[PDB]
Amino acid sequence: GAMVKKDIDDTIKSEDVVTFIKGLPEAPMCAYSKRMIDVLEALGLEYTSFDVLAHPVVRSYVKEVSEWPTIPQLFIKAEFVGGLDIVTKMLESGDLKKMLRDKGITCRDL
């Protein structure tokens, strides 16, 4: 049936990687949304991607619960990590592959 704000909240508890973006992950309506999905695809991860423009419940979760200013946003193991500006710095430093390998999350060759 229809998705309620509690289905996003239980999904953040269910999935190992979650993101909130401006579009579908295959056809985003923002360049930084393309660029976040390229972190998630280029490392070979498994994730759930939520579109704010397609459902008011998603943009409402971002308003009240994802209280950080920047869009788009990254979540790992039910916790907020950073915006698009920051995920690249973890990628460069190796700290992103370090967290994935420490938590046992799926990615490319360590």
Please report which band the strand proportion falls in: under 5%, 5-15%, 15-25%, 25-35%, 35-45% or over 45%: 15-25%
The sequence of SSEs as H and E is HEHEHEEHH
Shape: globular
User: Please, what is the oligomeric state?
Assistant: monomer
* Class computed from helices, strands and strand pairing: alpha+beta
In the CATH hierarchy, what is the superfamily? Glutaredoxin
Query: What strand order characterises the main sheet?
Result: 2-1-3-4
Distance between the termini: 40 Å
Radius of gyration: 13 Å
Give the fraction of residues assigned to helices: 40-55%
CATH fold group: Glutaredoxin
Q: What CATH architecture label applies?
A: 3-Layer(aba) Sandwich
Number of helices: 5
* Main pleated sheet: 4 strands, mixed
> How many β-strand runs?
4
Count up the domains.
Answer: 1
CATH class, please? Alpha Beta
Keywords: Iron, Iron-sulfur, Metal-binding
Organism: Trypanosoma brucei
Domain Glutaredoxin: 17-81
Protein name: Mono-cysteine glutaredoxin
Which labels suit this protein?
iron-sulfur; alpha+beta; 16% strand; four-stranded mixed β-sheet; 5 helices; Glutaredoxin
Describe it.
The chain has helices at 5-14, 31-42, 56-64, 84-93, 95-103, and strands spanning 17-21, 48-51, 73-76, 79-83. The chain is an alpha+beta fold and 110 residues long. The protein has one domain (7-103): Glutaredoxin (3-Layer(aba) Sandwich). Strands 2-1-3-4 form a 4-stranded mixed β-sheet, sandwiched between helices. A hairpin with a 2-residue loop joins β3 (73-76) and β4. The longest helix has 12 residues, at 31-42. The N and C termini lie far apart (40 Å).
